[PDB]
């Protein structure tokens, strides 16, 4: 049981770091922009057997987009990432969402606010309202502190499998 998951969001929001953390458990301190896309399978053990997410970690930098949109073909779910320490990354969220729905019909999409470990958040909870507008699931997240780091995948898994009782 596997699903194509496309990870999108502005450059530097921590998409790659987030994936590596789940992959190796290591925290990437450097910022090395992703070129086009990097595909990594993530396996989660659940009370209903292992579930595999083929994560298409896309580039947030306009110049390194590669196929960009083309990576969404046959995606079955997605995670939209923005940086809680950067207001502009939350502002671009609607654009990432639009790109996703113009290619993917009715896939489960989770919105993630990353870097909540950082002292002062530039994008505070009260300002985050896009999920209410489009009925999306939202999560404060931190690839560094692992705060809620499995939540996005748990919600998607429950959504794809059709079992609200699925546990990791």
């Amino acid at each position: 049981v596997q699903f194509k998951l496309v990870l999108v969001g502005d450059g530097g929001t921590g998409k790659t770091t987030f994936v590596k953390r789940h992959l190796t458990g290591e925290f990437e301190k450097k910022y090395v922009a992703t070129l086009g896309v990097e595909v990594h399978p993530l396996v989660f053990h659940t009370n209903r057997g292992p579930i595999k997410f083929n994560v298409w970690d896309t580039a947030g930098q306009e110049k390194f987009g590669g196929l960009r949109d083309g990576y969404y073909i046959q995606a079955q779910c997605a995670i939209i990432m923005f940086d809680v320490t950067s207001r502009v990354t939350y502002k671009n969220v609607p654009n990432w969402h639009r790109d996703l729905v113009r290619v993917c019909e009715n896939i489960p999409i989770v919105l993630c606010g990353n870097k909540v470990d950082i002292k002062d958040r530039k994008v505070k909870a009260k300002s985050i309202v896009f999920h209410r507008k489009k009925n999306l699931q939202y999560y404060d997240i931190s690839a560094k502190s692992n705060y809620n780091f499995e939540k996005p995948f748990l919600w998607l898994a429950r959504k794809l499998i059709g079992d609200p009782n699925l546990e990791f």
Partner: protein, 458 residues
Amino acid sequence: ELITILEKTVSPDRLELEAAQKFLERAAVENLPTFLVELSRVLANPGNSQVARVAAGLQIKNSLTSKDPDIKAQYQQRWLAIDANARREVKNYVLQTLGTETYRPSSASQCVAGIACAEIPVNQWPELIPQLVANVTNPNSTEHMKESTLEAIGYICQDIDPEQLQDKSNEILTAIIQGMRKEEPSNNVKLAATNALLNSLEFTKANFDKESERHFIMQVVCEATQCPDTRVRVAALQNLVKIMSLYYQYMETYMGPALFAITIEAMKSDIDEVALQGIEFWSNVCDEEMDLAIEASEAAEQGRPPEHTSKFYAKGALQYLVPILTQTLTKQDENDDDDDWNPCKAAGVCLMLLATCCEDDIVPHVLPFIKEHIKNPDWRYRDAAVMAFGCILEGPEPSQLKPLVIQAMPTLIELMKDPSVVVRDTAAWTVGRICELLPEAAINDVYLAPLLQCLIEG
């Protein structure tokens, strides 16, 4: 071998994707006209796999636009510089694919919009809008034909500078309503049309200024909120939310004789996605009215309030919203998680927005429910009681907010040892919020302090 490389775009091997990407970029540089004509042919052939058709469509679309306004301007120029006959070829194949894709979001629609944004402002595809309008209204048009072009129409309106397409807004709006109207048999078509309207709301600003047309748009939207299909209802409710945000000042004539009952009904729906929007409608009204209040807060001055006319819809619906919201705080399953974004969670957020929006009138409306269920044997109601209490601690002046000390506190402390973990966590949440408000009601030196101290351990 173009189809072969387009087929590789879905492969997980970076080596395959890079090879495909390098091949596509080169072909574009080598001979853009032939590349786009061939890509459009792959797109048009219903014999091609979905991967091949979508990939071809996105290649074409990404040659005509960019998130970068300068790159986009250059791409649009690059296209316009292409041999007009070749472009006619791409345009023909693209339009001809509308209605031939067996998958829902179609890729030809994006191409149509990409080319439209470049050619319309220079007036070069005069046959576009008329053809699309006819595709929607033709009685013999298939459902796929209708969906495809409605998507395209919406994308065009969402993407071109308004100014360049106003000369045909009325004709565009007419097609969109036709696709939205009750008599339309397909829910997929109604959905595509309702989505097209939503993507086109900002583009229809001019039309919203025409009373007659404004009435017709609200007409079809409200009706769509009554469509049996859940997806159409949700999309229609989303239109009302967006309309309230973009056209707040025209809502008087519709609020009361229509919007109120529709949104109230949606909030009570057992279909979660529907209740969510019914709730968002009012949470959104609070956000808009809170602005009209920060705007109006201009005893700094420069004339009268800009164009502010907060009609305080929230204040007026408060008596009806609360009992619905507090009841919604009761909808929690044994498998629901504290932070799932569901009606229960949305109601809490809406309550708090009403709390700061109508800083006082809430207390009187919420207290009854708190007192009736703060000890209810059912944890859902018990939890709802505690949560509601905490949703009114932000707004009401601490003076009135002292009904936490006397009665609340003792029980709020006990509830933290409740058999139910949900109840416990919410109790803690509420108690924590009380610590933030206490200093506001500083009343009692060396008593406000020790309390905070003891409380802190909890």
